[PDB]
Amino acid sequence: VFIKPEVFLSLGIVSLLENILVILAVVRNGNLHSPMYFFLCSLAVADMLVSVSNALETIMIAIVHSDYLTFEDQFIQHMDNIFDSMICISLVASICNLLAIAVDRYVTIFYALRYHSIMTVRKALTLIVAIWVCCGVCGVVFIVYSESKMVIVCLITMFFAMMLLMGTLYVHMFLFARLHVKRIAALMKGAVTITILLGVFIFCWAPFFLHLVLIITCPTNPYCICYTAHFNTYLVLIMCNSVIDPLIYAFRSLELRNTF
């Protein structure tokens, strides 16, 4: 029910270092590499924002627990809102960048000769900025009306939809690759890669949104309170995802791995 303050701080610094290193390795090479690496940089920024926000809120929680009160009931509310809005916008931005990477891969594989003429650097940048603008607006609006509105219903369906999208895209990609094998051996690796990607996605993001579903579908069942009691353990898994993301996306690129 209660997680040590050290854990959030422990994950924050490691994810900070990893995502800073990813951004540096992209910068310390071709400055305008491709639309492929702009999405990696944006995902690194979103992971860094998630970790920084959670670690700062953890230190603020630890600072005032019993003694040395800052203010009674007005300034602490403002600080709580300020941190929670940042966490929410970074959450939505992280999920959106994960989906954008998958759509880019799909377009490269399935429209291979006409890519580069359908996805330019200008369109990559104008989509990244739109992703971040929409995510920030949605996060602030959600957090402001977080009290009793239906912004929970608008927050879970989104995720499910996005989840579905990834689950389709990558799966289709894998099946296509299998066809190619069937014409090369007549003269598994993809399954493991797909399993790693999708399993990390669901097992790191789904518990929190299942908690969100449970607290509004039936908040009084005796077995629906035994799940919504590890809320902190589900906040930990999101920072674990922020740690693991640069390992399975940028660390697998030979050029980036060669840069550092």
Partner: peptide, 13 residues
């Protein structure tokens, strides 16, 4: 008293 927590939506308010 308004106590701060780790994120919003952690109890069925």
């Amino acid at each position: 008293s308004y106590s701060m927590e780790h994120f919003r939506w952690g109890k069925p308010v």
